[model samples]
Target: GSHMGVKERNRLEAHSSSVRGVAFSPDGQTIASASDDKTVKLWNRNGQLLQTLTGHSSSVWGVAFSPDGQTIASASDDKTVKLWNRNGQLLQTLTGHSSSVRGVAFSPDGQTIASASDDKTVKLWNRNGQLLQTLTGHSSSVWGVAFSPDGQTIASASDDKTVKLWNRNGQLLQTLTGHSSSVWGVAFSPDGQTIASASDDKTVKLWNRNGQLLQTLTGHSSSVRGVAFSPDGQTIASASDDKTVKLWNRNGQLLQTLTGHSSSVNGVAFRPDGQTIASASDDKTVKLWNRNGQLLQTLTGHSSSVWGVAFSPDGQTIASASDDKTVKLWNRNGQHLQTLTGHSSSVWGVAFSPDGQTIASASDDKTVKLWNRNGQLLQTLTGHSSSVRGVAFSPDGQTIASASDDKTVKLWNRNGQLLQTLTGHSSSVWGVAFSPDDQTIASASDDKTVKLWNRNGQLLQTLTGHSSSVRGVAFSPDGQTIASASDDKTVKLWNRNGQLLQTLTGHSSSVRGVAFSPDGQTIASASDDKTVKLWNRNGQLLQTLTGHSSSVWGVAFSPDGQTIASASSDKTVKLWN
Candidate 1:
């Protein structure tokens, strides 16, 4: 699947305190991270720490690499901007700032460095540490500084609630104002035609070179701390105190939100190739993310194994159930939107209603819970005497079916009223699915059989070819066939009449989940072998997807069939194209 989305590829965590800033070298092979621990560290693209330059006596707040990649500059609370060679030897310390130096940037020619300071000024210095000029128009502390791509102008963000542009000779060009609070960071688009400023007002303002406001991007829930543009200039990333980094297009449309940071995200930087983004966070780590690729994205943050995953009807959202006793909601791009809690025990399954207005989750607490799209608990279904293992909504979304250790399948209406209880299974019912027309229900059980039941609780047929327990079951989109996953390390496809059509047996361990593509032409099976296998309807193996470090527990396809989301015991959900 070459048409996937973005995913996290690496996480660097050697800093003992918050990581305040991060930047990519000119060649994109090395990464520089400045931290509250008073040091600057260099790391390779693969996340291996190469060196730690430790001259700062106070917190190092920002870092930048010269255009030539031979020198690194770090801004610190020690009131100094330190320049160091690539080998980690300190070269010079520019010390004219009256207060903390908050940010630093190198000019395109690598001949000058600009530093923003709490002293309410932007100071320019030569590579040899000679003071060139000091631009002092801002009314309050200057927090961030950047040079235009042409190296002819500089932009500084300040607590005065404005962004100021100045020429290299210290002459004020324009003052862009509109933010109601402090502007914390500023960056120029790759073409130098537009400037973006992040602010404490929780917005990123995009402006033209002449200082005319172009757009106000405002989805962040807290102060926006930093901003950066993609190398191609089509995307903008803004870091925020909300613990997320949001990506937006030039027209102010939000493209995605990067979540996973547990504390405020302080800075964002794009790799020179535009394929990856690095974010520094108050959580004390730096994370590298693939902008868009075949693996799509990995949804992290779950503290325990993810047991089930489902896509919303419109394909814009995903819901995941976890052993942490919660269900998480994420946008299709893997940004965590909300977490639904209340389950007293591990949640094993989650499903979005066909209308995408509600979510249903099954848990080991002998209950099934229903929640609204906003995460409010609408109802608690508590009739089951044993742990509920799986839950699914009927195609029309009027009814819900839950499989349980009570050896039964309970069908309930949207209002939590029990409709019927199908009880022929002699062992725990592990999985349940509804036919396309909502006329029949398929239940997989530890009794080693797949039972078909009518909506009225009537047993229709039993397919018993598996040598071990049946773990999961699903019906084709056309309702012509049923696919069942088993502990026998196989997936069985059978016709509606209970006749076996084909058996897929390549998995080395028990298969835990199974799903059919939206077109009903392909099947995906998740297994304890830590891989997901794809097969055509005729039982021909097509592909084996491997990446999860632990057993794969559940798998699902997006509504368009362009993406597949798999949940694993590794505490993550991986999306594949």
Candidate 2:
């Protein structure tokens, strides 16, 4: 049973925007979400928002944390990587790419960083924020980049329809060309014995460590965006534009198809244990699943299509939002309870309230709203002149914050009253959230910044992290953690006091949601990959659940805290446990 793909468990529609990516944190206690609304949010395992991160000028395209857990890197259309300290503080801005950056990675030692861009090049950087090398070989835009377990090699995928292997020195090692279409993503098996690649050709391909074709997995009708191996290396997970997340054996045999999202699945990642998977989609929500592919639960209720997903809050329930003009509410049992609505347009961002009752939802309407008591629409706040892309409730539930298309946050009350409008960014606000103490709201924006705001909506700190928009944001349940989700499908977690905690890796495409569990021990998430997942506190995947026939839009936990629920454009509601 453990060797098979996740089974179809449940399905639901959570957002109005297309989901993009998904992931879980190292402790599996929280999840982060991202969206086209240009916002990033954090949630507990119970599907509650602990906080939100805003500070991206454009659409957030990539997100990831360092291995040593000291820093976070978010890539965006702004063509930059903004680095932040674990406490959600601005550290530095890595800006060197001439085009949109699509992928990012931290070396095993956590000293080196790698990124892929549309410029058809891969650049290397150091934690000190210095450009190291530029690896150029692809004939087209480089879509993805990954570091080997030992950090000796890096793998990249590109529109050139090939996968390239590179040495740590930025030297070209091998070019694995086999796919007839664009190679969108690539991943290494847990043991590094094989490599997996997802392509626009609608197929998953496997190759030996030496770059020899080993197997071909074909089933999806559209482009494949994400891929990952089970923790045991016995199976592979893939997300596709075909509106599905497919599971396959290591030998390249089709195992199962987990479908839920109505649009396209852009990313998929397995929890550390390989028992769960986090998926993001164009549909706007992140989801989690058990290894059985059986219906477990879904995170729904975002206002638009979801883009990214992460995990936080002790791993009890899951948290995610969408573009339906509001964020949604759910229990771990996968039951719809309430809707956090306020945005005039679409709410693409959502995160759990660290206090576990109040949740924040961001919107394209350029406003943020706070909700509590199982996600009831309690407040409708506005500040930004443009669309409000992200929002997050403080861990204490004493404060509410938001990010907007106008590149500002308008602090507010539970009754839709604006308290303060913090403005420092020169671009659109993509994500926002407060620290564990309700003292700070971290924001990601198109300007490629991760800014920290006081509870009063005052700019306290600014981290130039990404080159583009920052998509998602989150904070750990203990009030000592923070994380961000992005279009890159990577999750970055940090300690409350500005300590880099961990980089929860994996997934393809943009990331939409993340959450920690109620007990503050596990994590859950949803994604464009059309799958849901559960994880251990150490980022170990406990299970992968699949079932949605289209892109998954939202994810959330039940009030009773035993079930998981999800929403999708497939217009279905799924229940899981």
Candidate 3:
């Protein structure tokens, strides 16, 4: 009686914004998102935005959370950097860039920070607001950046269709080239031996540490945005502007294409659960998924550009904040179920109400809203004067927190009451999420550090791993995992306890959606590739469904766990039986 089936997609009623990012937290309790709306928001696994965050003057290009779940970060075209706290308070402002910052990263020990800019340079800094050095030599804008798993090297992408290797001292080591179009994203494997790059040429390129062009994974019709190596380094994941993310083997064998974003994808990340991957896109939504590219849900309702995404609560629904004036709700299937609307300008971050009912949505409007289940409107809280970018609810749901374009995180009560605003970040707090146990919050910023926060929104820790914008994040299912998806495209998976996990692969464009099945026995994914797939818990492929005449925007399964549903640019909603 309870079986899944298929039907035609709706000929009308489509998402105006294309999805660019998605992620599920380690505990599977929350999801975060970023978008072209230039904002971010948080939500529960069931698709409920707790709050919003905003700050970037232009479309946020990337986002990410720290390994300790204590900080969040974002990059944009504003050509400047700002930071905030988990409570939506202006922390500090970091200026001195000749162009827009495109990527940011944290070190493995969470002690140093790194960033790549359109100025063709990479900058490194300490958590204490000091610039250590800047690496130059890129022939064009550095589109992507990432630190090696060993924290000894960094990878950067550029318009030259190449990925450049660098030492910790910002010294050039090697140049990996083979892509045909502008190289948009890059990532190093967990072992730090191989690198993956995404490009506009509709391909994903794999290279070795010696700059050897290993393979070319192709299967997209447009530009590629991001790439990530599986935690095991057995597969490569890629995201693209074609509105899809795809997976492949080291041999260039196409694996699965996680198709879901209604528009272009900007980033991708994976959960340490080893069962799902997260992705961000222009669609203004986030999603959780398995390695097979089967969609779980489309986090929706952002009023602006969605460029970043992350997950919290251990692999639950992907918490995705957006740029729309409002952050929204989505169930892993890419369905728009609720709306966290209150910000005046744009929402940049969102999170759950700890108990999973109360929500916090931060925004560019310099305010946040606490919402409830069933799409009920609750209280609107205001504090920051500049745009807000990130938001989170304490583990117990008793306290709500947010980050802002003003460079700070603010704490608030459930009834729209501002309690405190912590400040210390020298850049935009573009990403944020609570730890699996709700003990701390992580905020990634343009300053290149992922700051940690306590329940009272007090500064706790700072992490530095990525070399550029930390665009997305997620906690593993067992609560011992943490993962970050970035404009770099390569998803970095880690244990909530901070142990690295096997990174899953697939995606030809900027990875857009990721999710795990109800029983955690299966994983579903969606991407710009215009296809959907189902995978086993072990990251093995199960089924691949392809038929959308255009890009898929959203995907979902009936609550009963039968019948998968999907939305697409073909202007239709399709059901799979």
Candidate 4:
């Protein structure tokens, strides 16, 4: 099936220019942001823009809070690093770097700041802006820097296509030289024994403490932009110019690929609990993903590309910086709790249970979700290998049928337990319907065929000869005849014995839906050529119903057979008396 649009929790539009970076404070109660507007703004977890630290003269590139959460360090294209207290007071301006400062990070113990620069150097500075020692080795610009958790070493990534490890005392320790392009990001595992670096080579490289190459993670189709370790160090997350975030186990196995970004991804960070990831992208949005790679929420309100994102220490809030010159805030369950927008893409199928108490929706998110009539989610069924396309409840309301692009039809009980998997189709299954007797089910497929199966998932028949995709199938009122609609612009009728009786071919375009009136004396077929055709039980053309300005998708007769209702793509529904 397809997936739904993002579920945004809230929108914060306090800044007036492009936002460049976002970081959560130590207490999880505050968020800090740097922007192209030359300012660092502070916000409460509830979205109040508390203070704006206005001292930087040009675009701010990054922001990070000290380990104690009492101060913030900001790097800028203006060739300076600014330190500010939590109260927005400008403490000091570090001016040793000769070119743009690309990134800044605080040592875990909060004593030293490591700043990477386009000046091809990593500079160590004290709290008072005094230059401690400079570690220089990269032949090109330094894009990212990170201090080990133990504060004994620093890791830096550079456009020189290498990663360097340096001691706190400014001595170069080791150089990692496997990446074929510019290395953009670097992070240390929580144990400080391993380093993960992301590069324009479309890969993430893992290294031991001694700079020994460990693993090369290479599924991304574009440049890898950022890398970070989960708080527990059990997993690593890499963001990419491919517009996706990939989670990998420590052993280098790919776990999940989190997609939905509309453009290049720029940053990724995990929460302190290691349960969630916040990713920023050129798509102008920040999406929150769970450890399993499911989309939990989308943070909107930024009008331009989002550059950096992070979650709060308590795991209750998220902060994202965007090119719209603003920082946005949201709660963990996404913006609104009850209207949970969890799926990342298209919603393809929906059906009400026989009792009308539950709604089953199949989606490209690769899950079939059950919901109550009141809109509460009941369960998420996750066995499908591809997009789920069709969903239906059994006549007894005790079983459900779900068709997927994986070429399988899964049968489940009302409580969501898998009963069986019917697997004869060679392509995507598009539709499934239960016979009136509840003993047989028919599934239409893109393989140009309709398949009949018993309730036990046993294949009964394969009705072929439709030159194109079969779109829908329905049983006659007596369960003795079956009608199938197809893209071949025809409706084929067959008996329960699998014998083709007739092919009604009046439609000028693909016939999308077909149905027999309750009496079984009349048949209605809907088509894409802006018409609905009426026929007799013998396949004789009776009448052509017209009023819709576009394709007709569905038609149904009233319970009493006194009226026929048609739904069309023209946004109109007409009742024929």
Candidate 5:
């Protein structure tokens, strides 16, 4: 007997950010991916990177290949469309859109280019980059554009909740309206008789060239971001935010639901042979699958363990630090969202700002990096003489504190300016935290003690109950109590005056992380025993959550105190309720 299903063939991993679009060359020998990393990459059919097309000033949102397979066109947030030769040489820049360009396509005749833009228009250009016409019927941002097989007609999808058809000369032919929300992707069937539009309404609508509604394919649980017709025109594929690619026949009957992408599936493309499909995703990788729904390959880079996890202020997103030298963002459902990849070495810690707009990560590369929620690197804070082990954002979101192996704790403003450095620890500082009131800082160290300091860097108290290295520290919600986890296999509770309150026991190995629930009623500890132990503030055991197969290095409670997330050496982050 043979096992059969959509098997992943290869995992192509090169982009450091969300992959926005993917396309196969007319010859099916080359694959191109556009990314928020501000570049387009070309790859061979086997998933080997061939060339990186650079020069875009902002995120590249879409990519397409010429009908002849000799050129590539990329649309970018920089408000321009660029054309490049097959070998990655810059050919021309089409510059007329006043806002970000969202999608690009080549005419079947290979002589013209069509681009959709946030400026609420579709522009046409000749091979020489000369602006030919501006199609302006849509009232909102145009997200996608496609040319008919005969090259005489154009179809566009818009946020206005409509798909518009136009002639090649820029005259509106008809408005196809049925979707209840923004239309994100548009495609013409190989025979040029039918049109498909993917929408935020979570449905794919089919229409005839005469503007008659054909069928509505509905199964996706979230917004459908991209749609494509197989080369044979018998099958349709839709990529969705629900992290699955759905296939359907032209009659609108659901066929196979391809599931594997860890984040929103941004785009889908079929090879010219109609036997393979490629999907681009916010998870930062491109995946290939066969017609029967077997995954052919997951093209990705190296793998590494996750070390730290933190929830955003709203509890809707989770950020995990990893030895892969990156910080990955995820939704509460465990779907990978974005990859922040600027760190040169292992990223030891990650934290979200109080406002949920910025994220900070500490790295073994001896620096701290700040980024926006979109994965754009904003600033890098340097000065640490050794690897930074922990990072925390103050309650007001204006300052950040970092603990380093250099035996020091440094405070810096959000702008990356050093505010102060406290240097009393005799060994490496393993973890740091800010009080709920933002007036005091708590730090754990290899010296087996936890130190308390004022915002001005003045030492307030030194706690010394742990018999082994203190690896983690946290302040209660009310700011009166602190919890420290140690390699001694126990967690110690202390007051501001350095008096020991209680010792939490039961873990058979080192306890690496400790956290207080948002209401400060419960304490959670992560341990090398591969379990997360929950206890009451008074130190009575509440629950033992055991699912991890390796050391549990970090634990965090959601903002509402209804869920817990744990990071482990097994390279996975698990959420608990």
Candidate 6:
């Protein structure tokens, strides 16, 4: 897994109040954030605080970076707009507004700045703080302002429930009126032919460049507070007080609703590529989104700790077993498909048949159950005297192998008939797997070793080296080697002859689960250290995946060998590519 999930790369937490606005520098190397804490802080892309501009006497509400990336402009409740160098040194303070300044924007040429204020006027100033023009046609406070892509016109949103377009020299162009409540935010499409505005009326309105009402978008349950157009001008993003960011196509069709913000969302902006969105909310966090409008974190529906997870043979579906006694099925995009629920105890393991027509699950109820894709229960194999901890299906889909706390590994036919019982360990068995040829079985045990057996219930190899319980085992696709995870915090690779090849050690806690990519080139291991480690066939550590807040319980590679899914005690499953 490289970079396929919604990942929080960094958390900037130095602000003492709700962060109001965030802007990226033209070079994309730095970020400028304004806060209700009365200051504007500059940070590098890595979230390292570089400078704090502290001249604002009240809340700083908006921030913008100069096109040249050398200057910064900020709007504040102090009734003034201030200019500062990238080093945080004050350049000038443009004081013309009699009330709070709510928004600030810079022209494409970096020669002028536009500020919206509660004084009911939008002021334009040169880089030297000289007032160049003041457009005043609104009946109420101005909440937001923006310039067309060519910087030929300015659009301002007001509390009077209207958006007004004006020339760069203060001449009113046209007025757009449709919303019934205050229009809080305004933006121009990248092509300069359309305008989008967010209003307190719980809607987003789109207008043609000629001031004609184009469309009305309605879905937000509360005030629609902010609006933005993608760089390609084909999509729109609206932030609302309802705690969601909605994505819409140019035709006003709702595409996706992103729900990660815990409080009112105040602003939305797209990256230069139009593929990523950065949203600022009163929740004190900034969330990132893909073009699909999904919050960076995917597969977040689980309400309880997920204990085990496996991918379907075609990589289009995922099955996760949880301590909540439920096994959930989801599509590749993390959309819930179904929930398999009949287990009266915690579910420990899940596997899909090679044909992708059946699912096998093991539970603490001492039973192994089989189900169809629609979640219909088909068979319940019940012979184990203790909790059934692991399950696996043969490559041919003819045999099912289950490991139990009763110190036994049982083999069953597809129709639920008992075939064989291989017992060689003195303690509970934790994991089981079948060789590619379906002629052998590998079981990890609390007895501190891995037991390999022939298909005829005969013990073949007793690989012993761990100083603690062996929790997971897997066979490479070629069936030439085996990998085992242990409480000893190491992953050991052994050849078919039980000869130890290499010991991979980096995890700081117990290693709980291990897997191999379909192509047999990479090994993935999940650990209690709150991370998943990837290693090459030569036992060299590749990458350490870190996002979960608790212990990682299981790891599985997609059948296509291009993605990885991880289960965690954090109540969520994460997908990576």
Candidate No. with top lDDT = 5
What lDDT does candidate 1 reach at residue 493? 97
Q: After TM-score superposition, what is the CA distance of residue 302 in candidate 6 from its true location, in Å?
A: 2.6
Which is the winner by lDDT between candidate 1 and candidate 3? 1
State the weakest 10-residue window (summed lDDT) of model 6. Answer: 4-13
Clashing residue pairs, candidate 6?
6-296
Lowest lDDT 10-residue stretch of candidate 5: 1-10
- Model 4 TM-score (2 dp): 0.51
List where candidate 3 sits over 4 angstroms from the true fold.
1-31, 302-577
Specify the poorest-scoring 10-residue window by lDDT in model 2: 1-10
Off by over 4 Å in 2: 1-17, 304-577
Query: Model 6: per-residue lDDT, tens digit, 1-577?
Result: 4323324222212354567877778776777778787889776644445677989999998999989889999999999899999878999999989899999999999899999999999999999989999999799999999998899999999999999999988999999988999999999988889899999999999999777888888889999989998788888889999999999986778999989787898988887766567777776555667787665521123446788989999789888998878788877755556678799999999999998889999999999999999889999998999999999999989899999999999999868899999988999999999999679999999999999999899999999899999989999999989999999999999998899999999999999999999989889999999999989877888889997889999999889988788998877677777
For model 3 the TM-score comes to 0.51
Error of 6 at 393 (Å): 0.2
Residue 307 miss distance in model 3 (angstroms): 26
**Tens digits of lDDT, candidate 2, 1-577:** 1222334343333333554555555566555555555545455566654444557676666666666444667666678777765556667778989998887778878888888999989999988889999998798999888887888889999999999999977788888889999998888887776889999999989997677999999878889998888778888999988878889986677888887665688778776756677778886666677787763445555453443221235444445555445444444444454554455666566666555656666666665666665545666665466776666665565556667777677776677777787888888776665655646677766675566767665666665433345555555556555565555555556554455456555554454555554445555565567666666555566776677666664454544445556555454546666
In candidate 1, what are the lDDT values of residues 4-57, reduced to their tens digit?
332323221256578999999999999899999898988876565577798999
Q: What tens-digit string does per-residue lDDT give for candidate 5 at 386-479?
A: 9999999999998999999999999998779999999899999989999987789999999999999999989999999899999899999999
For model 4, the local distance difference test gives 0.76
- Between prediction 1 and prediction 6, the one with superior TM-score is 1
Task: Score every model by TM-score.
Answer: 0.56, 0.54, 0.51, 0.51, 0.56, 0.52
Comparing 3 with 4 on lDDT, the higher-scoring candidate is 4
